[PDB]
Amino acid sequence: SSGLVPRGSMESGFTSKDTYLSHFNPRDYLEKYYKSRHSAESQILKHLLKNLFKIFCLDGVKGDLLIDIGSGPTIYQLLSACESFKEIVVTDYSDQNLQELEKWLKAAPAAFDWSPVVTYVCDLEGNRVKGPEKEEKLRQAVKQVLKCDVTQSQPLGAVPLPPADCVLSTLCLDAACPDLPTYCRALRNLGSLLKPGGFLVIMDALKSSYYMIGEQKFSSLPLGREAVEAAVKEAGYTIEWFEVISQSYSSTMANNEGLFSLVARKLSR
Amino acid sequence: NPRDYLEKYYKFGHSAESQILKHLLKNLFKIFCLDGVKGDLLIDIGSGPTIYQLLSACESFKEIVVTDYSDQNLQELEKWLKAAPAAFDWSPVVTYVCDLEGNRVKGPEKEEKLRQAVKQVLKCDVTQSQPLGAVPLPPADCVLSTLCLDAACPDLPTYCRALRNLGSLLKPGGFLVIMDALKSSYYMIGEQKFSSLPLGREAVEAAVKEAGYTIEWFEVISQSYSSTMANNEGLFSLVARKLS
Amino acid sequence: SSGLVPRGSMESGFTSKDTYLSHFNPRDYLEKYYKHSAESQILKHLLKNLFKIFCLDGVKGDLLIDIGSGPTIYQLLSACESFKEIVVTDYSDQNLQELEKWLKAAPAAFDWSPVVTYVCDLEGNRVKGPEKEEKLRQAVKQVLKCDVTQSQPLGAVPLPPADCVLSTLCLDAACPDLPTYCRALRNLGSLLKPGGFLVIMDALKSSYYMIGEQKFSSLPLGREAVEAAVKEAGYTIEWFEVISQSYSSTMANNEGLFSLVARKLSR
Amino acid sequence: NPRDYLEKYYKRHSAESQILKHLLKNLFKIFCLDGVKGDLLIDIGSGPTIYQLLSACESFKEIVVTDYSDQNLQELEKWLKAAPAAFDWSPVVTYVCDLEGNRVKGPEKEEKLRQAVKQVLKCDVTQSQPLGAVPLPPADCVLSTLCLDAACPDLPTYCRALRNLGSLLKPGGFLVIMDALKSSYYMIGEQKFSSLPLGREAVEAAVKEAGYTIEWFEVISQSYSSTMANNEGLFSLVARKLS
Ligand SMILES: NC(=O)c1cccc(CCN(CCC[C@H](N)C(=O)O)C[C@H]2O[C@@H](n3cnc4c(N)ncnc43)[C@H](O)[C@@H]2O)c1
Ligand SMILES: NC(=O)c1cccc(CCN(CCC[C@H](N)C(=O)O)C[C@H]2O[C@@H](n3cnc4c(N)ncnc43)[C@H](O)[C@@H]2O)c1
Ligand SMILES: NC(=O)c1cccc(CCN(CCC[C@H](N)C(=O)O)C[C@H]2O[C@@H](n3cnc4c(N)ncnc43)[C@H](O)[C@@H]2O)c1
């Protein structure tokens, strides 16, 4: 189609998985969302980083292992977490995305430049280190780069990992879940990776039915904050903290109505 | 081949095809006789060789124009309109619509009201900006298309374009009535396999809105054709209005 | 709370159950919704739909249970042609009293005869209004308290497994969230035979409805949430319709209504 | 009684200690990371406390502290005037200094706040002129923590109070509110006070009806001890006054 519906959605109503293997360009995605001055995208990124900073450095969400689900090609969402977690596992469905991440982990000269984001977080954190040291500390924290599929009851396949203290997921489950029972199942699937009492940290868009990568359109599940809270509690978690902001992406990039952050814990049997 | 289609999809005797036809007849009865879809001119698009989709409509439209891509299909229509002995036997279908209508009428009266209402039998192509070519027609109250556009459009942009082309035959505020297959990529006539656009309901909604219509009513049923004839997963019916 | 939020919702965010005993006035509700207008058009569509379901589509059997009847009976008129026995239910005792008055043809009851005449016209004028009303009155065997949020929605009252469960404009008002809604559909499933029919009609994307100046909570679901909830509850949808007609702005903020017919799955 | 309140609510590893730390972290975020800043902040229902102005004084040149109770204001002024009978806020002052990067130590922070507070006034949020006859220039930000729940006997009064507060604000100025959710009472020693048990949706409806657009809204589940209040969590919001 030609913008009539999201790519890979004509038959099913929702962007198929294969669309993320064929048409998700990580370089274009990074160029569009993480790369002029005080744009909507810039403001959203600052708010995300401030929240991750507050969750991981001021609120002391911490432990041995953190798993980042649906990382895409980005690493901004780990910069503060690596201060509180000894080991980070990064995951995405897209092999293209895993490639971009591993290039950045190798500090390949062709990889995306996160320096401005890194400097921002370092300044949030008090300027105790400069950018380079913060980047290398994250590179060292990232122990595994893995394929994942949230809709599967073992989201990482037969890949054995110790139970994690935290699962983080930014801007992923909306794009990954074609309906609210799938969403809830995905949250339950993520639960299989968590220690009892582990932390679930989700950031995503509210009421977004698509997002753009340039002229390429991808489905989003348009959930309100009540639907998100419902799904999280049904999936077996208790919510400690739940926030909404009005700031939205530019219309040329998504039709979201704000974003949410939440911190939850996996309940008892 | 028009008769082969009639034999396979409108055979009589229970069957998935019987059930689909009955639900088609009941939705059109609802649209044209209980609901307020009426007017002076109705145009049916992609009629093929069939008349079942006109049985309730002729109760509400003074004049009807039947169109299709295949002249061979239109010859088959005309055999029934001229009541040739070999023409397809639609009386069990005429009977079932009459009973839906309260047996207000009997078969023969129903068949003659349809023959009188059908005023023109035209060649058409939904992908052209003028779907009827240089044949002029007054602006129509209603355009009707059953099981046509999925077969006619090889992709979703064409589908949207077709809906706009059809709109050019429609007054502002006129009715668009469409019934078609959902998620069907092929349908069979004998062992001849034809292509279909396998679109879901969200894509239909998106195409209709984008072509300049607002949807009044949209229904989907789960009943499909049997495996030997099409791989659809249900059917939709919708009634839309042409925006200004 | 002075309209700022629905009555009974200030603490929880959703109209409490007790509010339906205190503040839901049957006669006011009937005057407001069931007396052209957006409300009349909606009623006409509901009646044409119930006509198609029970008379043309052959949805039929021994026992139908109507859930959340309120004080109304329009939703049973076509049904009593296809069902030997009808059981009506509502959470509100005031509603049940209004129904009992109409069932005994109390002279002070609400007059359904124009609605009755309309349905007799839909059905072919085979009979006139009075005969049809008396067929319905004889068909209604029980009037029962119900609470859709409890796993036995009719409590300990024994009934044979029903052939159909009908629910018009109720579940939205009754369920404060998606999980209660899906659980309520499961509860309703307990009253149905396997392969039994579930027929729901309700508003789309409605967060409140008005009776005069009284504001009641509604659960604002879209068509995909509804389809998802029904399927998780153990049903398979046979047909699902949406219409764009909504209540006038002073009554509710809905964006259309839906109708569906479903069947309780094999186990 | 203002000193009993202070000893009970703001003196180690308890539900109250947890709530206070959440309040300070959110105040720090709003005023030092989010860039809520300007000329004049008006603190509404301050009681005898100052913790809620520690971060704010970094971003506003002038602060006005207000309360319904004269006793509360005299307790507060005892701290502004560095009287020896004042509550010792130093553990709290230290925590905020630690939140801000230890750019300063306490005594500097303490002095920064004392010269920012320009007036100590009476206020009643239910009156259309909450500060009575005292004229103030239009404020950039109105801050109220744990006040409105205690002050309003019902939701319409809650909403009216929020409009009254807006009469002090410039159009496009900030409203910053933190309060209890679903609390009907709170305890000061043996003495029981009444609270409006608002849910979060009621808070949002009241705020928008009073003529603000909400930029962010956060709820936390953490509650006071049962011996203190029967709240079920807390909320924070930052809203803008519409024109
Ligand atoms: N909702 C929106 O409107 C919306 C608005 C703006 C931006 C985005 C980004 C959407 N995008 C994620 C950004 C990545 C990074 N964490 C970040 O914060 O920027 C979607 C990601 O989800 C993965 N994904 C797909 N299906 C998956 C599956 N079944 N199992 C596991 N993973 C899956 C895709 O690989 C892709 O990395 C969505
Ligand atoms: N999708 C399916 O799974 C599917 C399932 C079951 C059956 C069918 C048959 C589809 N077929 C017949 C329907 C006829 C009649 N209205 C009826 O309800 O039976 C489609 C008709 O559409 C015409 N047509 C082609 N291209 C055209 C064009 N460009 N411009 C205008 N017209 C065009 C063909 O001549 C043919 O008459 C498809
Ligand atoms: N969604 C809307 O915007 C909306 C818009 C317009 C009108 C309405 C009416 C909503 N209202 C009346 C429908 C009555 C009748 N069947 C009819 O179609 O008119 C809902 C009925 O649901 C009952 N009910 C409450 N809680 C219950 C419980 N826990 N268990 C069982 N039952 C319960 C109430 O007593 C009330 O009779 C809602």
Ligand SMILES: NC(=O)c1cccc(CCN(CCC[C@H](N)C(=O)O)C[C@H]2O[C@@H](n3cnc4c(N)ncnc43)[C@H](O)[C@@H]2O)c1
């Ligand atoms: N809700 C709860 O469960 C709850 C839980 C725990 C604690 C509290 C305390 C409630 N109480 C103290 C907050 C003080 C300080 N800002 C702080 O964050 O500690 C509220 C203050 O609000 C003032 N106040 C009353 N009516 C007023 C009016 N009409 N106009 C203006 N002002 C008014 C009273 O003088 C009192 O100082 C309530």
